Design a protein. Structure first.
Length: 251
C-alpha cells in the first residue's frame, strides 16, 4: 500500500509504544497520559486498560493469549494483564533501572531492555530467575524484538545501531542499517524482516533477512516516531510520538 491510515484513537499525548495481537487489536502506551489504550480492528472507540497505579509506560507487548505486558518507568517494573482481567500482575524481574522495551515470544518468555543497566533480561513463564542475555557494549538500549527462532533484536540507542543476538552460538552482530539517528523501536515479522523507527530522522526503515538493502517505508510527516509493530498480514503500525497519533500502512 502507498498511503498511511491514521488510526481513530483519541486524546493521545506523546504515545511511545505499540503492539498488535492476532485479532488485529492495537495497543498503545499513551505515555503523556499515563495509560495504555486499545482499539479493536475496525473500531472507532478505544478503551483504556485497567492497569492500576501505572506511572509513565515505556513499552507494550501482547502474547497469543491476549495477555498485555507493559513496562513502567515510575514504578520501575513490568506488569501484565490477562485478557478480560481487572487485576495486574507484577512480573518478578529484579534490579531494573527503567525497563523500556518489552517483547514476548511464543513460549511466553518475556524480554525487557533494562535501559539504565545497559542490558536485556528475560523471564521464562512461571520462573522467578531472570536471565541476562549475552549482549555486549549496549548503550541505553530501548527497543527489543524476538523472532520465531528466538533471535533477539535490540535497538542500541546510544550507539545508533540495531544489534542481533543469534540463538545458540550467541554471536552478536550489528545489522547493516545505515544513516540511523537515535533508533528507538524495533519489530520483526515472520519472514525475519526487521523494522526500525529511525527517530532522529523521522522515518521507519526495514531490512530483509541477510539483505544489504534498507527500504524506507512511505509514511508521511512523522515527527519523532518511536514504537513500531507488524501484524501477521505485514501491516506496519507506528506511534507518531510528535504528532500524538498512530498510523498504519498495509503491505
Amino acid at each position: 500500500s502507498n498511503t498511511q491510515t491514521v488510526l481513530p484513537f483519541t486524546g493521545l499525548n506523546t504515545p511511545n509504544g505499540v503492539a498488535v495481537d492476532s485479532a488485529g487489536t492495537v495497543y498503545v502506551t499513551d505515555h503523556g497520559n499515563n495509560r495504555v489504550v486499545k482499539l479493536a480492528a475496525g473500531s472507532n472507540t478505544q478503551t483504556v486498560l485497567p492497569f492500576t497505579g501505572l506511572n509513565t509506560p515505556n513499552g507494550v507487548a501482547v502474547d497469543s493469549a491476549g495477555t498485555v505486558y507493559v513496562t513502567d518507568h515510575g514504578n520501575n517494573r513490568v506488569v501484565k494483564l490477562a485478557a478480560g482481567s481487572n487485576t495486574q500482575t507484577v512480573l518478578p524481574f529484579t534490579g531494573l533501572n527503567t525497563p523500556n522495551g518489552v517483547a514476548v515470544d511464543s513460549a511466553g518468555t518475556v524480554y525487557v531492555t533494562d535501559h539504565g543497566n545497559n542490558r536485556v533480561v528475560k523471564l521464562a513463564a512461571g520462573s522467578n530467575t531472570q536471565t541476562v542475555l549475552p549482549f555486549t557494549g549496549l548503550n541505553t538500549p530501548n527497543g527489543v524484538a524476538v523472532d520465531s527462532a528466538g533471535t533477539v533484536y535490540v535497538t542500541d540507542h546510544g550507539n545508533n545501531r540495531v544489534v542481533k543476538l543469534a540463538a545458540g552460538s550467541n554471536t552478536q552482530t550489528v545489522l547493516p542499517f545505515t544513516g540511523l539517528n537515535t533508533p528507538n523501536g524495533v519489530a520483526v515479522d515472520s519472514a525475519g524482516t526487521v523494522y526500525v523507527t529511525d527517530h532522529g530522522n523521522n522515518r521507519v526503515v526495514k531490512l530483509a533477512a541477510g539483505s544489504n538493502t534498507q527500504t524506507v517505508l512511505p509514511f508521511t510527516g512523522l515527527n519523532t516516531p518511536n514504537g513500531v509493530a507488524v501484524d501477521s498480514a505485514g501491516t506496519v503500525y507506528v506511534t507518531d510520538h510528535g504528532n500524538n497519533r498512530v498510523v498504519k500502512l498495509a503491505a
